[PDB]
Structures are given as structure tokens and as C-alpha cells.
Amino acid sequence: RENPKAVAEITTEGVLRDLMNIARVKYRELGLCRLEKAARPRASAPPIEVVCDSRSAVIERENIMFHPAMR
């Protein structure tokens, strides 16, 4: 109920609004969002899986590892 964040967004002189976005602005202004990647992982893998010779295991894999509601 009492927080400057709300007021700074409604005032027309965006002074405190800009003072609260300094980090996100300068990150972007430095071009770090557009500069080529200088590194990436040399190897990549999918998650390790249980292997079980049952159908319930296959269903439960799909329910968790490909979880529809999160997805």
C-alpha cells in the first residue's frame, strides 16, 4: 500500500522511474545484448533418465519430464 515504485510510474517527469532502471538500461546501452557470444559449453546433454521395462514408467516420464501444465 505504501511503495514509491507505484508513484514513480505515474509522474510525468520520469526521474525516479529512470533511477530505478539504471541497471537494465546501461546493460542494454553497452550492447552486451547484441555482442556475439564469446563462449558456450563445449558439450551438451539431455537429462539422465530412468529406464524401466514397464508402461507406468513411460507414462510417468511423460507426466514429469514433459509436464503439460508447466509447459
Partner: protein, 449 residues
């Protein structure tokens, strides 16, 4: 390009017979130590051995680190050289024995052939198809996507699994884009727009790219260099799938984890399949633990088991300390600062102080390496330090003296510019005298004890 402490070192300077040339590849002297380091290079290039230990033993400034960096050059770029100080082992994220294992497996390399099996084309149709689920509460779900890909010499219609559509969707693909798809990972890349309809008047700052030449479906092969540790990290923090765990694992903060022996053992099985399939060359390398006296008795007791592993790199230690207390074991003193039962495991390469004429040679090698053209009387001046003062103090004066000479308008350093460098920039011993004479009593102007 920038000049650093070892920029003059190029190699061990051995003959083909393995004897050291008295001045070669940037070295002066240490010949017996350079010859021993040659036999170690032979031990590394012959892949047959695991977990042999070498100790470079000798006082500070005797070129122990120059020897290790010379080994790193005689091995060339293919072999993994993994340098650490003993002070890098104390992580806040994971136990210090984890960091040792990570460095042990970072020192074993693998070169592996990989087939990338891919689809590439201009997206010409994209049509999702979906089902009304039973009442799970999240609503309808896309059952599949049908996508049309056009290349220069063919086209496909692809019926994607919806996990690849999520790659397509999070890649913000549109009709008329050029895209790349890996059947390996299910991953997607938006390469650009087509060069068709490449009208300039977009604010979107698109890269328009040509239609992919060749067929839509391709099966290229490339050779990848990886360490065993790269595989450990990939499988401990999975990120290459399109599943929810791989997805969220890219959004979470990255953190190191105490990768189990169970994972490492099973990655040995995986890598040995690549060897038996003929797609990989195992290329074991070397771990250089500089300042190894900064390891503690738990580190050293772990190294026992780690070196007994049926695969482990060669470990080169360096220490500069006499009979000293073992860290974490204040009851125990030993030579080199190494536990006596661990020292039994190593081959020790003792490393010796330089003679005054060797110092003169090093000063001249170092001067011309830095590009400091330097008169012979000036060489003799600098080389009287190194005898009376540390060798390092000689080499550090060359840059101030060069600046002072150039400021004096000289093309080259005279004795005068060194005699000024000696005055502006003290050695530790002259400064230690200033302390003891000024801090001879306390007061407003005293040094603080």
C-alpha cells in the same frame, strides 16, 4: 603481443638426443632440469601412463614456472595443459576435492567425430494441430505442428512433435523465415528472413539470408574437441533437451555441483563406446599444480586415490619451500611442504640458482624480448643486481629504465637510466631497511606494526 614474465620462453631447447643446449628456446642453464622436463614431455606424449607425479623443487625465481610453461609449448595445442595454483582449490560452492577432480578431468581431452543430422529451409507453411484434453485444468494442448520447409533443391513438409514446436515457438519462428533444426537435440535456430521480400522498410532490423543451397535434409559431420569434464558438466546440469528440466535448467542460476563418482564412472563407459565405435581419440594431458605447498593434507590425501585412478593425467607440482609445516597439519613438518608419504609418489626435479653470467644472458634475452635496446655497460649494471638482489629485480628495472631513457631522449638505455631506475624503484631489502630505520620508534610518522 603484450610482454609478460615468460614471453621469451618458447620451449625446452633440447636436442633430438634429449640433451639440453646450454642456451636455447629462451632458456639459460637449468640444463639437467630441462632434460628431466623433456623426459616428462615424452611420458605425456606416450599415452600409456596415468597418474604419474612430478615435482619441480627449488627456491623462488629459479624458473620452475618457466619449465612448466615450456612443457606446455613442447606438448603443443592438441594436448590439454591445465594450470592451477593450490590456492584455487578452496571453493565456496563445492568441497575442495571436487575442484581437484574437475581439474583432473579437465586435463584429459577427447577428440570425437560427430554427425549433425539436420533440416534447413525457408519456412513456407506452419500449421498447428491440437486436442481438447480431458479436464486437467490447463486447457487445450497442441498435438503437433505441420511445417513446410523449402530449400534450393527440394522441399519437405514436417509433422513435428510438439516439443520441437516449443523450440520453434521459443525461437519466435514465422512463416518466411529461414530456420535450422537439429534432430540430435530437437533444438531450433532462426537463421533469418528469406532474401525474398527483403524490403528495406522494416524497423525490425532483420538479417535477410539466402535460401539454403542443397536439399532440405542434411547429415553433416564435424570433429569436436572436448574434455571429460565437459561431459560431466553437461550431464550433471542437463540443458540440451527440449524437456521441462532442460528448459528450466537454462533459466536457473548456474552453480557448480559435487558431481558423483557414479556419474564419472558411467561417462567412462560412454566415452569408451565412442572409442570402440572409432569416433573418438582419447588424448590424456597434464595438470600443473603451481604453489602446491598451498594444498592442505586433505588435498594431498585425496590425490593419493585420484592418482591411483585407472585414468588420470600427469600431475606436475611446483614448490619453493624448505622444511615447512604442512597446511592443515600443524603437527607435521616436511620438506617441500609436501606430506612425506605423498612425496614418495613423485619424481623430483630439483632446480638450482643461476650463476652471474647466466643472469647476464637472461638479462640480454629479456631486454631484447621487451625490445629494450641496451648498452653493454648497462647490461653489466643490471646484471650486478640479480647477484646482489633477486633476479626478478633485474628484469623489472628494464621497463622503467626504457621509459626514463626515452624521456631523456635517448634511443637506448645507458647506465644513467638504470641508476635512476634503481633510485625510483626499490627492491624489498632496501625498503625493509627503510621500515626498520623509520619504524625504529613509534609516533605520528611511524610505520604501523
Amino acid at each position: 603481443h603484450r610482454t609478460a614474465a615468460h614471453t621469451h620462453i618458447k620451449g625446452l631447447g633440447l636436442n633430438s638426443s634429449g640433451i639440453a643446449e646450454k642456451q636455447a628456446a629462451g632458456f639459460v642453464g637449468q640444463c639437467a632440469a630441462r632434460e628431466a622436463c623433456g623426459v616428462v614431455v615424452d611420458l605425456i606424449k606416450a599415452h600409456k601412463m596415468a597418474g604419474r607425479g612430478v615435482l619441480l623443487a627449488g627456491g623462488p625465481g629459479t624458473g620452475k614456472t618457466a619449465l612448466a610453461l615450456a612443457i606446455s609449448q613442447e606438448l603443443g595445442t592438441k594436448i590439454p595443459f591445465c594450470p592451477i595454483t593450490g590456492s584455487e582449490i578452496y571453493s565456496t560452492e563445492v568441497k575442495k576435492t571436487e575442484v581437484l577432480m574437475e581439474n583432473f578431468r579437465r586435463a584429459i581431452g577427447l577428440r570425437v567425430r560427430e554427425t549433425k543430422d539436420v533440416y534447413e529451409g525457408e519456412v513456407t507453411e506452419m500449421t498447428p494441430e491440437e486436442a481438447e484434453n480431458p479436464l486437467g485444468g490447463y486447457g487445450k494442448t497442441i498435438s503437433t505442428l505441420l511445417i513446410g520447409l523449402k530449400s534450393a533443391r527440394g522441399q519437405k513438409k514436417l509433422r513435428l512433435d510438439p516439443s520441437i514446436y516449443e523450440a520453434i515457438q521459443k525461437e519466435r519462428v514465422q512463416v518466411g523465415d529461414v530456420i535450422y533444426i537439429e534432430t540430435n537435440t530437437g533444438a531450433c535456430k532462426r537463421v533469418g528472413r528469406s532474401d525474398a521480400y527483403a524490403t528495406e522498410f522494416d524497423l525490425e532490423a532483420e538479417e535477410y539470408v539466402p535460401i539454403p543451397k542443397g536439399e532440405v535434409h542434411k547429415k553433416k559431420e564435424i570433429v569436436q574437441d572436448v574434455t571429460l569434464h565437459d561431459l560431466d558438466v553437461a550431464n550433471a546440469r542437463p540443458q540440451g533437451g527440449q524437456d521441462i528440466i532442460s528448459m528450466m535448467g537454462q533459466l536457473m542460476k548456474p552453480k557448480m555441483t559435487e558431481i558423483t563418482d557414479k556419474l564419472r564412472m558411467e561417462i567412462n563407459k560412454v566415452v569408451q563406446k565412442y572409442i570402440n565405435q572409432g569416433v573418438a581419440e582419447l588424448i590424456p594431458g597434464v595438470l600443473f599444480i603451481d604453489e602446491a605447498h598451498m594444498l592442505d593434507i586433505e588435498c594431498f590425501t585425496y590425490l593419493n586415490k585420484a592418482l591411483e585412478s585407472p585414468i588420470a593425467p600427469i600431475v606436475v607440482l611446483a614448490s619453493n619451500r624448505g622444511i615447512a609445516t604442512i597446511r592443515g597439519a600443524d603437527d607435521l613438518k616436511a620438506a617441500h611442504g609436501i606430506p612425506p608419504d605423498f612425496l614418495q609418489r613423485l619424481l623430483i626435479i630439483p632446480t638450482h640458482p643461476y650463476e652471474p653470467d647466466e643472469i647476464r644472458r637472461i638479462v640480454r634475452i629479456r631486454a631484447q624480448t621487451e625490445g629494450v635496446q641496451l648498452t653493454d655497460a648497462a647490461v653489466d649494471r643490471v646484471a650486478e643486481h640479480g647477484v646482489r638482489i633477486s633476479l626478478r629485480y633485474c628484469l623489472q628495472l628494464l621497463a622503467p629504465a626504457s621509459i626514463l631513457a626515452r624521456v631523456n631522449g635517448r634511443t637506448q638505455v645507458d647506465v644513467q637510466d638504470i641508476a635512476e631506475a634503481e633510485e625510483l624503484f626499490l627492491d624489498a631489502r632496501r625498503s625493509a631497511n627503510i621500515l626498520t630505520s623509520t619504524g625504529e620508534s613509534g609516533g605520528l610518522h611511524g610505520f604501523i606494526s
